[PDB]
Design a protein around this ligand. Structure first.
Ligand SMILES: [Zn+2]
Length: 96
DNA sequence: TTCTTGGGTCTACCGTTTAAT
DNA sequence: AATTAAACGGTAGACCCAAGA
């Protein structure tokens, strides 16, 4: 048996692994809902994890791994951190 | 039967914007 | 002006599940 792409496949298969459609409505989990139990398992494993989009920052010399840590140290909102970084009245800048 | 794939369904936390003070 | 909350928009990684191998 041959896949539409040209490679051989078992007669029990509809396509080769690479050509299988899994996007949108063709996904095996499309339109399914996760149970409250699954959501909790995901919740516990994620608690305390910082994401990859964090920005190291220097607050005029005092550095932080992310803007949120700086917000928590100064006790201000994250929005204000961004505001000071853009302000000509502060020397707060992201590293890189 | 098991092991592998890989993208839809989620969570926790980020950072930037903007309405409202 | 300088502030905050909430609206938006993003990442990786855990989960699920059917079908390829
Ligand atoms: Zn193919």
């Amino acid at each position: 048996k041959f896949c539409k792409c040209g490679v051989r496949i078992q007669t029990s298969a509809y396509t080769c692994s690479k050509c299988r459609n899994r996007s949108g409505e063709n996904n095996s989990f499309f339109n399914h809902k996760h149970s409250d139990i699954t959501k909790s398992k995901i919740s516990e494993k994620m608690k305390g994890k910082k994401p990859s989009n964090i920005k190291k920052i220097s607050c005029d010399g005092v550095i932080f791994d992310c803007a949120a840590d700086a917000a928590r140290h100064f006790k201000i909102s994250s929005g204000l951190v961004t505001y000071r970084v853009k302000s000509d009245k502060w020397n707060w800048f992201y590293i890189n």
